[PDB]
Amino acid sequence: PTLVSLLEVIEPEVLYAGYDSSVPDSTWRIMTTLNMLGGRQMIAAVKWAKAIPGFRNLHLDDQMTLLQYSWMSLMAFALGWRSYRQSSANLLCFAPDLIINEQRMTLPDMYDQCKHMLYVSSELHRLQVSYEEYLCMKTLLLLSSVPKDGLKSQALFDEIRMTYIKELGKAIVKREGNSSQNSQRFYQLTKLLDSMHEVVENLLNYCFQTFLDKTMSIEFPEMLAEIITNQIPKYSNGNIKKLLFHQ
């Protein structure tokens, strides 16, 4: 079995938001529903990560660390892919029953939070990213940040990350290209991977502010509330090394 075929079989199933479309829309209502959906998607992301070849061989503490750092990049990247596959238009497909269409984008403060996620689906469409490249890229996003002091199984992590970089290369070679076009493709895709750090920085700014300001009455499920409570002091103390492919 090829490695990308093993990343393929563990793709999470499609989750529904449980969004009642008979009731009118509001930014608060959509944000609340998406936070509850995000918690369920994160629980599914943990089950997904545990099935990635090599991940369960890392120290349990490193498994927790990597999931705590990358959760938002995994969410935004999986959302970008689902949006890119469902429409050729500017729509965020959070769930089949909750798509942020052009009318929903006009809701107060909806666009400013949606725009960073729209960048992901725009880039995947502009770069015409394949299913195999996406799978390798999403696994690389789980391995895109480490603590500034490193991991307990750092040597093993460096070996695993290298293996999935090699996998991305193999997926690229399949796209009917020559050495010069494949050099351009690897560069373009690793640039999109690099840009995910800036996408996440912007989404986490909204996330952390919305979570800390209790007067907004924005509910976060236990799974997200726990990750956010862990992540805020780590960003505060500079405890993060964001891995980059380019400088």
């Binding site: 943990v46 545990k50 349990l60 927790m64 726990e226």
Partner: peptide
């Protein structure tokens, strides 16, 4: 500290 995440990683799927 991160009780839920630890449980999901520790439990058998």
């Amino acid at each position: 500290e991160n009780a839920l995440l630890r449980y999901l990683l520790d439990k058998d799927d």
